[PDB]
Amino acid sequence: MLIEIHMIQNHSPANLNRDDLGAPKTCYFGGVLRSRISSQCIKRSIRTSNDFKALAPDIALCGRMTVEAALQVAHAISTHIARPEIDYFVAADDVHIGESMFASACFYKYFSIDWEQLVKNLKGDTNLAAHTVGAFLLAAAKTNPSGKQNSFAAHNYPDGILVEFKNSPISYANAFVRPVSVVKESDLVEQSIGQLSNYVNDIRLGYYDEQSPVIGFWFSPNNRYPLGYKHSKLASRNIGNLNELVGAVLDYIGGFKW
Amino acid sequence: MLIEIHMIQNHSPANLNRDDLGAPKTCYFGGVLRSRISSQCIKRSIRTSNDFKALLGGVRTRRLADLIQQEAGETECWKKAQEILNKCGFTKMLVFMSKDKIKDLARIVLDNSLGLTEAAQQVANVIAQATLAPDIALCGRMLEPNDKDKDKKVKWSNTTVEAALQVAHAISTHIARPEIDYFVAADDVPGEDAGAGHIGESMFASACFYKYFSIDWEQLVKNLKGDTNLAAHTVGAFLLAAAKTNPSGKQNSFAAHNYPDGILVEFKNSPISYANAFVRPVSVVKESDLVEQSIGQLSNYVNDIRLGYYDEQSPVIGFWFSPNNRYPLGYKHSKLASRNIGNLNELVGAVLDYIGGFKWEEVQKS
Amino acid sequence: PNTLFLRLEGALQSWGSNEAKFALRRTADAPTKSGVLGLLCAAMGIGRAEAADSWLPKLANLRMGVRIDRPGIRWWDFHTVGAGQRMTLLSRREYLADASFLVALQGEPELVAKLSAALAKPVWAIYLGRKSCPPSRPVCEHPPGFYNTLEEALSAVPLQKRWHNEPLPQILPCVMDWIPGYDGEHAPDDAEIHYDLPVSFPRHL
RNA sequence: GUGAACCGGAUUGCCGUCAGGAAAUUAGGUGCGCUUAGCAGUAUUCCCCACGCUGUGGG
């Protein structure tokens, strides 16, 4: 089976990843410039952390040197236009001007784990696989990339975690095909969830038949920026707790708990 | 465990940090312009504060030669001493180490009649071993020598010190409103004078700043070795200084010595910030003011985070400090904090008691 | 049904070229048959050692047809390897940004139908050349049909835009394999060779 | 399982010292809101119910 996880976030003025020349890395999509984060940072930010460490466990998830790992991750992107800035600093003597660059943007995270692959890689063990599923969920939710923390303490928590069980692996990058601007009645985050929710609002009416529908468990911080900002039932259940979300996922698939 | 400190402060028209062209620093958050004060400015103002003076035992500078020269009656420690200096591998780069070590060990090694390489290596080991200071533990250190123009025989040891404090750039809770001041300079004696006048342009702004501090207790304790009373004293003095110190910018022209109207202290196991509550700029309405609206938005964000991520195996508590209980966070019904205080000394006391059996007077001895 | 239609769409994708022997990895301007066949081998659930045994030639014998809806952008990334561990290795990886492709494979009807059925639910994961490029549009979005020529099969599929406005390219890039035709008929002046013929999972011709 | 899988550009930084926008000014000269009426000497009081061929009771 496929367990798709999606994530929308906003970040403070910082430099979470810079290139060889000292600039925040960029990309191209939606016809405009987009600030970026690598996948090889977000992986190994999830990994080798003191939080993730909770038949060799986690090696089935993350292989090393025909292991056939069952953890797949997408690439980060922006949800609007990028804006670079330059900081001018001097050094005192207590007894020359440089330049440092920073930007603020909205980014995305994706996770997907193959349950059958995880169980088979455990020599038939399924309870250990379920425990690994819970551990990965908790660690990914409770970790951030290790960027310039001591100067730019950018530690915003994710503003959305969406869980699906589609038959085919598909990412929702086609929501922000247009830049997301600001109006007097809204901010970035409230516009970000709505247009991603617009993608779920479409498609389902003119795509895969209801004979084999797709369910999901939604997670949001205290039901703010609600997935489906209306009375629509696009989400089977909206959850405001991480442990409750893990328990719901465990109940649906394997049947288990925490 | 990890100590967190949040602040909500309002400032009078001032220019505390400025860029190359002479304008207050600005940034972009949420698609709207915001004022900012740099983190380096805050760190420097805290480091040289009157409340941090008892724990100021380190120097970062490039005049290492003039320090040894002052610790000698013989005037023959100037040159070649600057060559012991100019060979450990130093282009007049700024060096950081404990002050108490240089004025003894550099004098005891430099003044002896020995070889250049041996003395240089001894001083290099002295510098790489001089980490015993609170500011070095807080603001960290990296020291790299120049391998292109260094002695091929000398060798450097580990000199990387991990910092134990993270300070975020001050970010205004609302939109940025820059201003321009037109000034003239007068001549005392009357006469023909100039023409249209030497009109200058000074830029300034006023904003409500959301400040965000974080002190990691375990790393600071490890950095200060087995001693823990010294670490507790450092934490208490640092909190006091942060509460009662301001950047020393254009202060002789703008005496913006305001103190924060709200402090929230939370003890967490993972870094948490509340800067996303201001992605929507604050607009002033005829009821309430900027500070109260900012505190209300902060309370909304904190209770949202709490009713979001929560764990039973690791509970957290907080104290909300407003002077004499004038600005409540959980104003309607919510008791997000547990031991609300209207005093800052009692805030230090509660923090120290949560840390351990530390009383302030007990730790004011190291 | 003679051909099945597949879509390769996402934020990024990669189709490596023969110019990858060092830390600098490069790509091509169009998908190669080797990558498509590897995707299919993943789709039907065959390992890297079983594909070489009487499984790849059947897929290679089918005709090649690919349509490019829009051009892409190559982008250089400063990937670093082995930092803080032992084996700091440095490398550069290039990616194609804002591009999409349509996959067409003409031949036997049974093989095409089986490929579409396995594409409805691949046994393993499916991606865009690299694990760090997930698909954006469904691969089985476009059901198979009956056609005579590859050009008609590729031009029958319409072009879908993203919003009401936006400029469109006036050239629709399409790529096909060179049909031998009658016995003989040496290759023309404008004949191109790619080192992308899968023989094993590496060996290419 | 795709010229692919296993993959962190990382650590180090006060823009600081100085400044009167100042000297001089009437918004003044012109205008009707005017013609009109019992809270009272009546000829069905808007609806409902009971008792008679007008007297009680409710809105």
Side-chain angles (χ1 to χ4, degrees), chain C residues 100-113:
Chain C
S100 320
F101 301 103
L102 176 70
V103 187
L105 314 165
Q106 175 152 296
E108 243 185 40
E110 278 182 1
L111 210 56
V112 155

mmCIF file of all heavy atoms in Angstrom, chain C residues 100-113:
data_model
loop_
_atom_site.group_PDB
_atom_site.id
_atom_site.type_symbol
_atom_site.label_atom_id
_atom_site.label_comp_id
_atom_site.label_asym_id
_atom_site.label_seq_id
_atom_site.Cartn_x
_atom_site.Cartn_y
_atom_site.Cartn_z
ATOM 1 N N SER C 100 7.492 18.019 -18.946
ATOM 2 C CA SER C 100 6.578 16.888 -18.914
ATOM 3 C C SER C 100 6.735 16.088 -20.197
ATOM 4 O O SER C 100 7.127 16.628 -21.235
ATOM 5 C CB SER C 100 5.126 17.346 -18.742
ATOM 6 O OG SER C 100 5.037 18.417 -17.816
ATOM 7 N N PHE C 101 6.427 14.795 -20.121
ATOM 8 C CA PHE C 101 6.588 13.910 -21.266
ATOM 9 C C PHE C 101 5.430 12.923 -21.340
ATOM 10 O O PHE C 101 4.860 12.528 -20.320
ATOM 11 C CB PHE C 101 7.915 13.142 -21.202
ATOM 12 C CG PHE C 101 9.125 14.026 -21.154
ATOM 13 C CD1 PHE C 101 9.800 14.233 -19.964
ATOM 14 C CD2 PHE C 101 9.594 14.646 -22.300
ATOM 15 C CE1 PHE C 101 10.918 15.043 -19.915
ATOM 16 C CE2 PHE C 101 10.715 15.459 -22.256
ATOM 17 C CZ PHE C 101 11.375 15.658 -21.062
ATOM 18 N N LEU C 102 5.096 12.528 -22.566
ATOM 19 C CA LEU C 102 4.098 11.502 -22.839
ATOM 20 C C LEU C 102 4.800 10.281 -23.415
ATOM 21 O O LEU C 102 5.615 10.410 -24.332
ATOM 22 C CB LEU C 102 3.038 12.015 -23.817
ATOM 23 C CG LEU C 102 1.962 11.028 -24.279
ATOM 24 C CD1 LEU C 102 1.008 10.699 -23.142
ATOM 25 C CD2 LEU C 102 1.201 11.569 -25.486
ATOM 26 N N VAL C 103 4.484 9.103 -22.883
ATOM 27 C CA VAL C 103 5.153 7.862 -23.267
ATOM 28 C C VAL C 103 4.213 7.036 -24.136
ATOM 29 O O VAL C 103 3.050 6.812 -23.772
ATOM 30 C CB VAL C 103 5.599 7.069 -22.028
ATOM 31 C CG1 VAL C 103 6.443 5.868 -22.425
ATOM 32 C CG2 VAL C 103 6.348 7.963 -21.078
ATOM 33 N N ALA C 104 4.711 6.586 -25.288
ATOM 34 C CA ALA C 104 3.952 5.742 -26.200
ATOM 35 C C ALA C 104 4.802 4.552 -26.617
ATOM 36 O O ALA C 104 5.959 4.721 -27.022
ATOM 37 C CB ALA C 104 3.494 6.525 -27.436
ATOM 38 N N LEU C 105 4.229 3.353 -26.520
ATOM 39 C CA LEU C 105 4.910 2.111 -26.871
ATOM 40 C C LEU C 105 3.987 1.282 -27.750
ATOM 41 O O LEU C 105 2.959 0.785 -27.276
ATOM 42 C CB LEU C 105 5.305 1.324 -25.618
ATOM 43 C CG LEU C 105 5.958 2.104 -24.474
ATOM 44 C CD1 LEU C 105 5.956 1.275 -23.198
ATOM 45 C CD2 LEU C 105 7.371 2.530 -24.847
ATOM 46 N N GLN C 106 4.349 1.127 -29.020
ATOM 47 C CA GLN C 106 3.523 0.427 -29.994
ATOM 48 C C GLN C 106 4.134 -0.926 -30.332
ATOM 49 O O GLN C 106 5.349 -1.045 -30.511
ATOM 50 C CB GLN C 106 3.351 1.255 -31.270
ATOM 51 C CG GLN C 106 2.598 0.544 -32.386
ATOM 52 C CD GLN C 106 1.858 1.504 -33.296
ATOM 53 O OE1 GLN C 106 0.938 2.203 -32.869
ATOM 54 N NE2 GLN C 106 2.258 1.545 -34.561
ATOM 55 N N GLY C 107 3.278 -1.943 -30.422
ATOM 56 C CA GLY C 107 3.707 -3.292 -30.728
ATOM 57 C C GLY C 107 2.574 -4.285 -30.589
ATOM 58 O O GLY C 107 1.479 -4.065 -31.114
ATOM 59 N N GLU C 108 2.828 -5.385 -29.888
ATOM 60 C CA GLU C 108 1.781 -6.356 -29.632
ATOM 61 C C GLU C 108 0.715 -5.757 -28.715
ATOM 62 O O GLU C 108 1.020 -4.942 -27.841
ATOM 63 C CB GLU C 108 2.365 -7.617 -28.999
ATOM 64 C CG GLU C 108 2.203 -8.869 -29.849
ATOM 65 C CD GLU C 108 2.690 -10.120 -29.145
ATOM 66 O OE1 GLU C 108 2.438 -10.257 -27.929
ATOM 67 O OE2 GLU C 108 3.324 -10.968 -29.808
ATOM 68 N N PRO C 109 -0.547 -6.142 -28.896
ATOM 69 C CA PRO C 109 -1.609 -5.604 -28.036
ATOM 70 C C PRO C 109 -1.588 -6.202 -26.637
ATOM 71 O O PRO C 109 -1.896 -5.513 -25.659
ATOM 72 C CB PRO C 109 -2.891 -5.980 -28.788
ATOM 73 C CG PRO C 109 -2.525 -7.193 -29.572
ATOM 74 C CD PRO C 109 -1.071 -7.048 -29.933
ATOM 75 N N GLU C 110 -1.230 -7.485 -26.535
ATOM 76 C CA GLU C 110 -1.209 -8.148 -25.233
ATOM 77 C C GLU C 110 -0.177 -7.520 -24.303
ATOM 78 O O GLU C 110 -0.465 -7.274 -23.126
ATOM 79 C CB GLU C 110 -0.932 -9.641 -25.409
ATOM 80 C CG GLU C 110 -2.158 -10.462 -25.773
ATOM 81 C CD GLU C 110 -1.850 -11.942 -25.901
ATOM 82 O OE1 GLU C 110 -0.682 -12.328 -25.681
ATOM 83 O OE2 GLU C 110 -2.774 -12.718 -26.221
ATOM 84 N N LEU C 111 1.029 -7.256 -24.812
ATOM 85 C CA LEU C 111 2.068 -6.657 -23.980
ATOM 86 C C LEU C 111 1.685 -5.249 -23.540
ATOM 87 O O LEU C 111 1.896 -4.876 -22.382
ATOM 88 C CB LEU C 111 3.399 -6.641 -24.731
ATOM 89 C CG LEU C 111 4.658 -6.746 -23.870
ATOM 90 C CD1 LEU C 111 4.610 -7.989 -22.994
ATOM 91 C CD2 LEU C 111 5.908 -6.746 -24.738
ATOM 92 N N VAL C 112 1.114 -4.458 -24.450
ATOM 93 C CA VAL C 112 0.690 -3.104 -24.105
ATOM 94 C C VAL C 112 -0.405 -3.140 -23.047
ATOM 95 O O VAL C 112 -0.388 -2.359 -22.086
ATOM 96 C CB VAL C 112 0.238 -2.355 -25.374
ATOM 97 C CG1 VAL C 112 -0.751 -1.250 -25.032
ATOM 98 C CG2 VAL C 112 1.445 -1.791 -26.118
ATOM 99 N N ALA C 113 -1.376 -4.047 -23.206
ATOM 100 C CA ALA C 113 -2.455 -4.162 -22.231
ATOM 101 C C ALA C 113 -1.928 -4.596 -20.869
ATOM 102 O O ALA C 113 -2.361 -4.075 -19.834
ATOM 103 C CB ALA C 113 -3.517 -5.141 -22.733
#
